[PDB]
């Protein structure tokens, strides 16, 4: 063995950290980047346990040593050549001591750009550029098909029901949106589209609901205390309801923007809608 050569990396803040050229023992305490790196085929020794909430990533990370957040003690025991942490991480310095680490500012990285962002790290810059081009092509054609199925101008809304309250997503690039809107090209509800978030997806009031509901709805229910079957307050009259155009999806899966969860969402969404479209 010979100490493998380095590459200097500019981070989201400090513009200097030295990292492995081909890291062979990466520990991520930042689950956002987990699936992204695995698709790139790099070796992951340690992954944040939170990934066990994604029916997709739970399965992609079987048996892999799972870390809590801030569990610096337990991580070093795997002696990782490279460590990845969110910028908002507590032990940012303590990890720099365990191994060379990169702080990633979650908020400076969206869906495809952040897969490039990860691409820039393990030098597999073209493994992503390639895959990216593939996705860009497929989802788009899928859109064409789903657009035929449900209507060329059908609006699709995206709703969560937490603790008996309803919430619609603001950001057209997360929690499904990336695929629905930015990949497939399905139309947004004009009012939902107006939402500023950039902010925790906002509660919809009992009255302004027809205003925010799409022709179809991709409805999840992480109001995990869960009181029952979505209720039916004013939810009774909705075009989507009335026509059976609500489609359910696992909340915790639809968190992650990593190529695995992404490619899953493509399948999951496309299927569920066209089926929902009678």
PDB file of C-alpha atoms in Angstrom:
ATOM      1  CA  UNK A   1       0.000   0.000   0.000  1.00  0.00           C
ATOM      2  CA  UNK A   2       1.008   3.600  -0.796  1.00  0.00           C
ATOM      3  CA  UNK A   3      -0.680   6.780   0.502  1.00  0.00           C
ATOM      4  CA  UNK A   4      -3.065   7.583  -2.378  1.00  0.00           C
ATOM      5  CA  UNK A   5      -2.806  11.019  -3.975  1.00  0.00           C
ATOM      6  CA  UNK A   6      -4.937  14.046  -3.050  1.00  0.00           C
ATOM      7  CA  UNK A   7      -7.243  16.573  -4.689  1.00  0.00           C
ATOM      8  CA  UNK A   8      -8.073  19.931  -3.118  1.00  0.00           C
ATOM      9  CA  UNK A   9     -11.802  20.695  -2.898  1.00  0.00           C
ATOM     10  CA  UNK A  10     -13.643  23.999  -2.478  1.00  0.00           C
ATOM     11  CA  UNK A  11     -16.639  23.666  -0.203  1.00  0.00           C
ATOM     12  CA  UNK A  12     -19.875  25.631   0.139  1.00  0.00           C
ATOM     13  CA  UNK A  13     -18.005  27.943   2.536  1.00  0.00           C
ATOM     14  CA  UNK A  14     -14.291  27.486   3.168  1.00  0.00           C
ATOM     15  CA  UNK A  15     -12.660  27.106  -0.182  1.00  0.00           C
ATOM     16  CA  UNK A  16     -10.039  24.498   0.794  1.00  0.00           C
ATOM     17  CA  UNK A  17     -10.140  20.840   1.931  1.00  0.00           C
ATOM     18  CA  UNK A  18      -7.904  17.963   0.782  1.00  0.00           C
ATOM     19  CA  UNK A  19      -9.645  14.672  -0.007  1.00  0.00           C
ATOM     20  CA  UNK A  20      -9.003  11.156  -1.416  1.00  0.00           C
ATOM     21  CA  UNK A  21      -8.894  10.892  -5.209  1.00  0.00           C
ATOM     22  CA  UNK A  22     -10.763   7.580  -5.091  1.00  0.00           C
ATOM     23  CA  UNK A  23     -12.201   7.285  -1.564  1.00  0.00           C
ATOM     24  CA  UNK A  24     -12.776   3.639  -0.591  1.00  0.00           C
ATOM     25  CA  UNK A  25     -14.289   4.101   2.864  1.00  0.00           C
ATOM     26  CA  UNK A  26     -16.777   6.977   2.901  1.00  0.00           C
ATOM     27  CA  UNK A  27     -18.965   7.687   5.905  1.00  0.00           C
ATOM     28  CA  UNK A  28     -21.948   9.955   5.392  1.00  0.00           C
ATOM     29  CA  UNK A  29     -23.842  11.363   8.324  1.00  0.00           C
ATOM     30  CA  UNK A  30     -25.741  13.400   5.682  1.00  0.00           C
ATOM     31  CA  UNK A  31     -28.387  11.103   4.147  1.00  0.00           C
ATOM     32  CA  UNK A  32     -29.105  13.511   1.295  1.00  0.00           C
ATOM     33  CA  UNK A  33     -25.881  12.434  -0.334  1.00  0.00           C
ATOM     34  CA  UNK A  34     -26.031   8.701   0.519  1.00  0.00           C
ATOM     35  CA  UNK A  35     -28.037   7.360  -2.421  1.00  0.00           C
ATOM     36  CA  UNK A  36     -26.348   9.848  -4.730  1.00  0.00           C
ATOM     37  CA  UNK A  37     -22.916   8.405  -3.984  1.00  0.00           C
ATOM     38  CA  UNK A  38     -24.018   4.780  -4.061  1.00  0.00           C
ATOM     39  CA  UNK A  39     -25.371   5.284  -7.596  1.00  0.00           C
ATOM     40  CA  UNK A  40     -21.872   6.475  -8.427  1.00  0.00           C
ATOM     41  CA  UNK A  41     -20.612   3.143  -7.039  1.00  0.00           C
ATOM     42  CA  UNK A  42     -18.153   4.604  -4.530  1.00  0.00           C
ATOM     43  CA  UNK A  43     -17.704   2.668  -1.308  1.00  0.00           C
ATOM     44  CA  UNK A  44     -19.871   3.669   1.621  1.00  0.00           C
ATOM     45  CA  UNK A  45     -18.814   2.355   5.009  1.00  0.00           C
ATOM     46  CA  UNK A  46     -21.179   4.373   7.158  1.00  0.00           C
ATOM     47  CA  UNK A  47     -24.544   5.985   6.480  1.00  0.00           C
ATOM     48  CA  UNK A  48     -26.888   8.083   8.606  1.00  0.00           C
ATOM     49  CA  UNK A  49     -29.664   5.879  10.067  1.00  0.00           C
ATOM     50  CA  UNK A  50     -32.389   8.263   8.830  1.00  0.00           C
ATOM     51  CA  UNK A  51     -32.167   6.579   5.429  1.00  0.00           C
ATOM     52  CA  UNK A  52     -34.171   3.757   7.033  1.00  0.00           C
ATOM     53  CA  UNK A  53     -37.286   5.859   6.480  1.00  0.00           C
ATOM     54  CA  UNK A  54     -37.033   5.549   2.745  1.00  0.00           C
ATOM     55  CA  UNK A  55     -38.467   2.203   1.631  1.00  0.00           C
ATOM     56  CA  UNK A  56     -36.032   2.714  -1.270  1.00  0.00           C
ATOM     57  CA  UNK A  57     -32.911   3.581   0.689  1.00  0.00           C
ATOM     58  CA  UNK A  58     -33.688   1.255   3.574  1.00  0.00           C
ATOM     59  CA  UNK A  59     -33.263  -1.523   1.062  1.00  0.00           C
ATOM     60  CA  UNK A  60     -30.214   0.083  -0.683  1.00  0.00           C
ATOM     61  CA  UNK A  61     -28.338   0.222   2.647  1.00  0.00           C
ATOM     62  CA  UNK A  62     -28.885  -3.188   4.279  1.00  0.00           C
ATOM     63  CA  UNK A  63     -26.557  -4.133   7.080  1.00  0.00           C
ATOM     64  CA  UNK A  64     -24.411  -1.046   6.558  1.00  0.00           C
ATOM     65  CA  UNK A  65     -23.201   0.399   9.855  1.00  0.00           C
ATOM     66  CA  UNK A  66     -25.792   3.057  10.714  1.00  0.00           C
ATOM     67  CA  UNK A  67     -24.789   6.232  12.539  1.00  0.00           C
ATOM     68  CA  UNK A  68     -26.881   8.566  14.631  1.00  0.00           C
ATOM     69  CA  UNK A  69     -26.179  12.239  14.159  1.00  0.00           C
ATOM     70  CA  UNK A  70     -23.185  13.445  16.132  1.00  0.00           C
ATOM     71  CA  UNK A  71     -22.102   9.911  17.030  1.00  0.00           C
ATOM     72  CA  UNK A  72     -18.414  10.723  16.448  1.00  0.00           C
ATOM     73  CA  UNK A  73     -17.310   7.912  18.735  1.00  0.00           C
ATOM     74  CA  UNK A  74     -18.997   5.155  16.705  1.00  0.00           C
ATOM     75  CA  UNK A  75     -17.869   6.528  13.280  1.00  0.00           C
ATOM     76  CA  UNK A  76     -14.124   6.567  13.822  1.00  0.00           C
ATOM     77  CA  UNK A  77     -14.330   2.823  14.600  1.00  0.00           C
ATOM     78  CA  UNK A  78     -14.731   2.333  10.844  1.00  0.00           C
ATOM     79  CA  UNK A  79     -11.749   4.523  10.023  1.00  0.00           C
ATOM     80  CA  UNK A  80     -13.205   6.287   6.961  1.00  0.00           C
ATOM     81  CA  UNK A  81     -10.891   7.828   4.319  1.00  0.00           C
ATOM     82  CA  UNK A  82     -13.593  10.458   3.702  1.00  0.00           C
ATOM     83  CA  UNK A  83     -16.457  11.846   5.772  1.00  0.00           C
ATOM     84  CA  UNK A  84     -19.530  13.872   4.692  1.00  0.00           C
ATOM     85  CA  UNK A  85     -21.509  16.227   6.932  1.00  0.00           C
ATOM     86  CA  UNK A  86     -24.124  18.940   6.549  1.00  0.00           C
ATOM     87  CA  UNK A  87     -22.871  22.460   7.055  1.00  0.00           C
ATOM     88  CA  UNK A  88     -25.431  22.795   9.841  1.00  0.00           C
ATOM     89  CA  UNK A  89     -23.659  19.948  11.663  1.00  0.00           C
ATOM     90  CA  UNK A  90     -22.646  20.263  15.317  1.00  0.00           C
ATOM     91  CA  UNK A  91     -19.344  18.362  15.382  1.00  0.00           C
ATOM     92  CA  UNK A  92     -17.983  19.994  12.214  1.00  0.00           C
ATOM     93  CA  UNK A  93     -14.521  20.357  13.767  1.00  0.00           C
ATOM     94  CA  UNK A  94     -14.388  17.027  15.686  1.00  0.00           C
ATOM     95  CA  UNK A  95     -14.972  15.181  12.406  1.00  0.00           C
ATOM     96  CA  UNK A  96     -12.183  17.059  10.640  1.00  0.00           C
ATOM     97  CA  UNK A  97      -9.950  15.331  13.170  1.00  0.00           C
ATOM     98  CA  UNK A  98     -11.379  11.848  12.596  1.00  0.00           C
ATOM     99  CA  UNK A  99     -10.821  12.073   8.823  1.00  0.00           C
ATOM    100  CA  UNK A 100     -10.869  14.708   6.102  1.00  0.00           C
ATOM    101  CA  UNK A 101     -14.438  16.003   5.899  1.00  0.00           C
ATOM    102  CA  UNK A 102     -16.589  18.092   3.596  1.00  0.00           C
ATOM    103  CA  UNK A 103     -19.348  20.272   4.988  1.00  0.00           C
ATOM    104  CA  UNK A 104     -22.210  20.560   2.497  1.00  0.00           C
ATOM    105  CA  UNK A 105     -24.682  23.378   2.829  1.00  0.00           C
ATOM    106  CA  UNK A 106     -27.966  21.513   2.248  1.00  0.00           C
ATOM    107  CA  UNK A 107     -29.562  24.715   0.981  1.00  0.00           C
ATOM    108  CA  UNK A 108     -27.118  25.292  -1.852  1.00  0.00           C
ATOM    109  CA  UNK A 109     -27.947  21.971  -3.513  1.00  0.00           C
ATOM    110  CA  UNK A 110     -31.126  20.820  -5.354  1.00  0.00           C
ATOM    111  CA  UNK A 111     -31.808  17.725  -7.470  1.00  0.00           C
ATOM    112  CA  UNK A 112     -29.558  17.278 -10.489  1.00  0.00           C
ATOM    113  CA  UNK A 113     -27.093  19.974  -9.529  1.00  0.00           C
ATOM    114  CA  UNK A 114     -26.465  18.176  -6.269  1.00  0.00           C
ATOM    115  CA  UNK A 115     -25.800  14.932  -8.096  1.00  0.00           C
ATOM    116  CA  UNK A 116     -23.232  16.858 -10.081  1.00  0.00           C
ATOM    117  CA  UNK A 117     -22.092  18.288  -6.718  1.00  0.00           C
ATOM    118  CA  UNK A 118     -21.442  14.750  -5.522  1.00  0.00           C
ATOM    119  CA  UNK A 119     -19.937  14.007  -8.947  1.00  0.00           C
ATOM    120  CA  UNK A 120     -17.373  16.712  -8.361  1.00  0.00           C
ATOM    121  CA  UNK A 121     -16.264  14.890  -5.216  1.00  0.00           C
ATOM    122  CA  UNK A 122     -15.505  11.328  -6.257  1.00  0.00           C
ATOM    123  CA  UNK A 123     -14.121  12.518  -9.598  1.00  0.00           C
ATOM    124  CA  UNK A 124     -16.814  10.486 -11.408  1.00  0.00           C
ATOM    125  CA  UNK A 125     -17.939  13.747 -13.069  1.00  0.00           C
ATOM    126  CA  UNK A 126     -19.013  11.974 -16.251  1.00  0.00           C
ATOM    127  CA  UNK A 127     -20.763   9.065 -14.528  1.00  0.00           C
ATOM    128  CA  UNK A 128     -23.359  11.674 -13.510  1.00  0.00           C
ATOM    129  CA  UNK A 129     -23.302  13.745 -16.752  1.00  0.00           C
ATOM    130  CA  UNK A 130     -24.165  10.445 -18.476  1.00  0.00           C
ATOM    131  CA  UNK A 131     -26.952   9.440 -16.049  1.00  0.00           C
ATOM    132  CA  UNK A 132     -28.299  12.937 -15.927  1.00  0.00           C
ATOM    133  CA  UNK A 133     -28.741  12.895 -19.695  1.00  0.00           C
ATOM    134  CA  UNK A 134     -30.569   9.547 -19.402  1.00  0.00           C
ATOM    135  CA  UNK A 135     -33.059  10.784 -16.786  1.00  0.00           C
ATOM    136  CA  UNK A 136     -33.581  14.096 -18.592  1.00  0.00           C
ATOM    137  CA  UNK A 137     -34.604  12.036 -21.684  1.00  0.00           C
ATOM    138  CA  UNK A 138     -36.848   9.437 -19.995  1.00  0.00           C
ATOM    139  CA  UNK A 139     -38.927  11.410 -17.586  1.00  0.00           C
ATOM    140  CA  UNK A 140     -39.575  13.868 -20.352  1.00  0.00           C
ATOM    141  CA  UNK A 141     -40.945  11.171 -22.639  1.00  0.00           C
ATOM    142  CA  UNK A 142     -42.845   9.771 -19.680  1.00  0.00           C
ATOM    143  CA  UNK A 143     -44.392  13.181 -19.246  1.00  0.00           C
ATOM    144  CA  UNK A 144     -45.566  12.973 -22.857  1.00  0.00           C
ATOM    145  CA  UNK A 145     -47.331   9.697 -22.001  1.00  0.00           C
ATOM    146  CA  UNK A 146     -48.720  10.785 -18.612  1.00  0.00           C
ATOM    147  CA  UNK A 147     -49.760  14.050 -20.315  1.00  0.00           C
ATOM    148  CA  UNK A 148     -51.802  11.970 -22.850  1.00  0.00           C
ATOM    149  CA  UNK A 149     -53.314   9.951 -20.012  1.00  0.00           C
ATOM    150  CA  UNK A 150     -54.587  12.640 -17.635  1.00  0.00           C
ATOM    151  CA  UNK A 151     -54.857  15.684 -19.849  1.00  0.00           C
ATOM    152  CA  UNK A 152     -52.347  17.952 -21.551  1.00  0.00           C
ATOM    153  CA  UNK A 153     -53.161  20.702 -19.020  1.00  0.00           C
ATOM    154  CA  UNK A 154     -54.078  18.631 -15.999  1.00  0.00           C
ATOM    155  CA  UNK A 155     -52.798  20.215 -12.821  1.00  0.00           C
ATOM    156  CA  UNK A 156     -51.136  18.023 -10.205  1.00  0.00           C
ATOM    157  CA  UNK A 157     -51.057  19.137  -6.598  1.00  0.00           C
ATOM    158  CA  UNK A 158     -48.843  17.725  -3.854  1.00  0.00           C
ATOM    159  CA  UNK A 159     -50.308  17.389  -0.347  1.00  0.00           C
ATOM    160  CA  UNK A 160     -49.312  16.260   3.138  1.00  0.00           C
ATOM    161  CA  UNK A 161     -51.689  15.722   5.997  1.00  0.00           C
ATOM    162  CA  UNK A 162     -49.947  16.284   9.311  1.00  0.00           C
ATOM    163  CA  UNK A 163     -51.964  16.239  12.577  1.00  0.00           C
ATOM    164  CA  UNK A 164     -55.461  16.788  11.084  1.00  0.00           C
ATOM    165  CA  UNK A 165     -54.174  19.846   9.105  1.00  0.00           C
ATOM    166  CA  UNK A 166     -53.524  19.921   5.317  1.00  0.00           C
ATOM    167  CA  UNK A 167     -50.300  21.135   3.686  1.00  0.00           C
ATOM    168  CA  UNK A 168     -49.375  21.829   0.101  1.00  0.00           C
ATOM    169  CA  UNK A 169     -45.702  21.979  -1.020  1.00  0.00           C
ATOM    170  CA  UNK A 170     -44.260  25.322  -2.051  1.00  0.00           C
ATOM    171  CA  UNK A 171     -40.933  24.415  -3.724  1.00  0.00           C
ATOM    172  CA  UNK A 172     -41.262  23.059  -7.261  1.00  0.00           C
ATOM    173  CA  UNK A 173     -38.122  21.063  -6.737  1.00  0.00           C
ATOM    174  CA  UNK A 174     -38.697  18.763  -3.784  1.00  0.00           C
ATOM    175  CA  UNK A 175     -40.716  16.020  -2.160  1.00  0.00           C
ATOM    176  CA  UNK A 176     -41.826  14.801  -5.598  1.00  0.00           C
ATOM    177  CA  UNK A 177     -42.068  18.135  -7.372  1.00  0.00           C
ATOM    178  CA  UNK A 178     -38.706  17.689  -9.071  1.00  0.00           C
ATOM    179  CA  UNK A 179     -40.159  14.695 -10.868  1.00  0.00           C
ATOM    180  CA  UNK A 180     -43.748  15.789 -11.297  1.00  0.00           C
ATOM    181  CA  UNK A 181     -43.031  19.261 -12.567  1.00  0.00           C
ATOM    182  CA  UNK A 182     -39.387  19.599 -13.431  1.00  0.00           C
ATOM    183  CA  UNK A 183     -38.926  16.113 -14.960  1.00  0.00           C
ATOM    184  CA  UNK A 184     -42.351  14.977 -16.262  1.00  0.00           C
ATOM    185  CA  UNK A 185     -43.590  18.486 -17.020  1.00  0.00           C
ATOM    186  CA  UNK A 186     -47.056  18.141 -15.538  1.00  0.00           C
ATOM    187  CA  UNK A 187     -48.852  21.475 -14.864  1.00  0.00           C
ATOM    188  CA  UNK A 188     -49.008  23.159 -11.439  1.00  0.00           C
ATOM    189  CA  UNK A 189     -52.073  24.538  -9.798  1.00  0.00           C
ATOM    190  CA  UNK A 190     -51.851  28.291 -10.571  1.00  0.00           C
ATOM    191  CA  UNK A 191     -52.270  29.266  -6.853  1.00  0.00           C
ATOM    192  CA  UNK A 192     -49.909  26.556  -5.490  1.00  0.00           C
ATOM    193  CA  UNK A 193     -47.447  27.702  -8.088  1.00  0.00           C
ATOM    194  CA  UNK A 194     -47.626  31.173  -6.617  1.00  0.00           C
ATOM    195  CA  UNK A 195     -46.479  29.912  -3.216  1.00  0.00           C
ATOM    196  CA  UNK A 196     -43.210  31.412  -2.049  1.00  0.00           C
ATOM    197  CA  UNK A 197     -41.682  28.409  -0.267  1.00  0.00           C
ATOM    198  CA  UNK A 198     -38.598  28.470  -0.153  1.00  0.00           C
ATOM    199  CA  UNK A 199     -40.292  27.719   3.176  1.00  0.00           C
ATOM    200  CA  UNK A 200     -41.915  24.864   5.011  1.00  0.00           C
ATOM    201  CA  UNK A 201     -44.761  23.773   2.762  1.00  0.00           C
ATOM    202  CA  UNK A 202     -47.796  25.747   3.868  1.00  0.00           C
ATOM    203  CA  UNK A 203     -51.005  24.691   5.516  1.00  0.00           C
ATOM    204  CA  UNK A 204     -54.100  24.906   3.398  1.00  0.00           C
ATOM    205  CA  UNK A 205     -57.152  26.312   5.090  1.00  0.00           C
ATOM    206  CA  UNK A 206     -60.501  24.453   5.022  1.00  0.00           C
ATOM    207  CA  UNK A 207     -61.865  26.903   2.487  1.00  0.00           C
ATOM    208  CA  UNK A 208     -58.909  27.817   0.253  1.00  0.00           C
ATOM    209  CA  UNK A 209     -58.514  24.110  -0.529  1.00  0.00           C
ATOM    210  CA  UNK A 210     -60.339  24.049  -3.866  1.00  0.00           C
ATOM    211  CA  UNK A 211     -58.026  26.904  -4.710  1.00  0.00           C
ATOM    212  CA  UNK A 212     -54.902  24.775  -4.097  1.00  0.00           C
ATOM    213  CA  UNK A 213     -56.035  21.334  -5.231  1.00  0.00           C
ATOM    214  CA  UNK A 214     -55.021  20.084  -8.622  1.00  0.00           C
ATOM    215  CA  UNK A 215     -56.842  18.042 -11.169  1.00  0.00           C
ATOM    216  CA  UNK A 216     -54.957  15.161  -9.536  1.00  0.00           C
ATOM    217  CA  UNK A 217     -53.377  14.972  -6.138  1.00  0.00           C
ATOM    218  CA  UNK A 218     -50.317  13.065  -4.987  1.00  0.00           C
ATOM    219  CA  UNK A 219     -51.290  12.812  -1.376  1.00  0.00           C
ATOM    220  CA  UNK A 220     -49.141  11.631   1.424  1.00  0.00           C
ATOM    221  CA  UNK A 221     -50.020  11.399   5.083  1.00  0.00           C
ATOM    222  CA  UNK A 222     -47.034  11.765   7.416  1.00  0.00           C
ATOM    223  CA  UNK A 223     -49.310  13.211  10.041  1.00  0.00           C
ATOM    224  CA  UNK A 224     -47.765  10.164  11.564  1.00  0.00           C
ATOM    225  CA  UNK A 225     -49.850  10.243  14.700  1.00  0.00           C
ATOM    226  CA  UNK A 226     -52.512   9.481  12.024  1.00  0.00           C
ATOM    227  CA  UNK A 227     -56.181   9.921  13.207  1.00  0.00           C
ATOM    228  CA  UNK A 228     -57.766   8.090  10.269  1.00  0.00           C
ATOM    229  CA  UNK A 229     -58.454   7.993   6.514  1.00  0.00           C
ATOM    230  CA  UNK A 230     -57.698  11.590   5.364  1.00  0.00           C
ATOM    231  CA  UNK A 231     -61.082  12.604   6.831  1.00  0.00           C
ATOM    232  CA  UNK A 232     -63.407  14.495   4.517  1.00  0.00           C
ATOM    233  CA  UNK A 233     -63.910  17.959   5.952  1.00  0.00           C
ATOM    234  CA  UNK A 234     -64.353  19.996   2.790  1.00  0.00           C
ATOM    235  CA  UNK A 235     -62.294  17.359   0.962  1.00  0.00           C
ATOM    236  CA  UNK A 236     -65.622  15.898  -0.256  1.00  0.00           C
ATOM    237  CA  UNK A 237     -66.307  18.117  -3.300  1.00  0.00           C
ATOM    238  CA  UNK A 238     -62.824  18.168  -4.881  1.00  0.00           C
ATOM    239  CA  UNK A 239     -62.586  17.386  -8.555  1.00  0.00           C
ATOM    240  CA  UNK A 240     -59.705  15.062  -7.842  1.00  0.00           C
ATOM    241  CA  UNK A 241     -61.685  13.222  -5.172  1.00  0.00           C
ATOM    242  CA  UNK A 242     -64.917  13.110  -7.117  1.00  0.00           C
ATOM    243  CA  UNK A 243     -63.029  11.593 -10.075  1.00  0.00           C
ATOM    244  CA  UNK A 244     -60.652   9.334  -8.072  1.00  0.00           C
ATOM    245  CA  UNK A 245     -57.608  11.378  -9.011  1.00  0.00           C
ATOM    246  CA  UNK A 246     -55.852  11.236  -5.665  1.00  0.00           C
ATOM    247  CA  UNK A 247     -52.802   8.979  -5.559  1.00  0.00           C
ATOM    248  CA  UNK A 248     -51.078   7.976  -2.339  1.00  0.00           C
ATOM    249  CA  UNK A 249     -47.295   7.688  -1.784  1.00  0.00           C
ATOM    250  CA  UNK A 250     -44.939   6.931   1.076  1.00  0.00           C
ATOM    251  CA  UNK A 251     -43.966  10.167   2.786  1.00  0.00           C
ATOM    252  CA  UNK A 252     -40.572   9.209   4.049  1.00  0.00           C
ATOM    253  CA  UNK A 253     -39.541   7.948   0.672  1.00  0.00           C
ATOM    254  CA  UNK A 254     -40.345  11.124  -1.075  1.00  0.00           C
ATOM    255  CA  UNK A 255     -37.809  13.066   0.923  1.00  0.00           C
ATOM    256  CA  UNK A 256     -34.597  12.187  -0.787  1.00  0.00           C
ATOM    257  CA  UNK A 257     -33.544  13.575  -4.167  1.00  0.00           C
ATOM    258  CA  UNK A 258     -30.963  10.849  -4.769  1.00  0.00           C
ATOM    259  CA  UNK A 259     -30.905   8.928  -8.081  1.00  0.00           C
ATOM    260  CA  UNK A 260     -32.309   5.841  -6.424  1.00  0.00           C
ATOM    261  CA  UNK A 261     -35.310   7.538  -4.798  1.00  0.00           C
ATOM    262  CA  UNK A 262     -35.583   9.628  -7.948  1.00  0.00           C
ATOM    263  CA  UNK A 263     -35.741   6.681 -10.347  1.00  0.00           C
ATOM    264  CA  UNK A 264     -38.229   5.092  -7.965  1.00  0.00           C
ATOM    265  CA  UNK A 265     -40.445   8.176  -7.949  1.00  0.00           C
ATOM    266  CA  UNK A 266     -40.441   8.147 -11.723  1.00  0.00           C
ATOM    267  CA  UNK A 267     -41.802   4.601 -11.727  1.00  0.00           C
ATOM    268  CA  UNK A 268     -44.109   5.161  -8.703  1.00  0.00           C
ATOM    269  CA  UNK A 269     -45.613   8.429  -9.987  1.00  0.00           C
ATOM    270  CA  UNK A 270     -46.033   7.472 -13.646  1.00  0.00           C
ATOM    271  CA  UNK A 271     -47.752   4.243 -12.777  1.00  0.00           C
ATOM    272  CA  UNK A 272     -50.060   5.638 -10.039  1.00  0.00           C
ATOM    273  CA  UNK A 273     -51.337   8.587 -12.056  1.00  0.00           C
ATOM    274  CA  UNK A 274     -52.129   6.794 -15.286  1.00  0.00           C
ATOM    275  CA  UNK A 275     -53.908   4.174 -13.221  1.00  0.00           C
ATOM    276  CA  UNK A 276     -55.587   6.948 -11.264  1.00  0.00           C
ATOM    277  CA  UNK A 277     -56.583   8.372 -14.628  1.00  0.00           C
ATOM    278  CA  UNK A 278     -59.039   5.491 -15.080  1.00  0.00           C
TER     279      UNK A 278
END
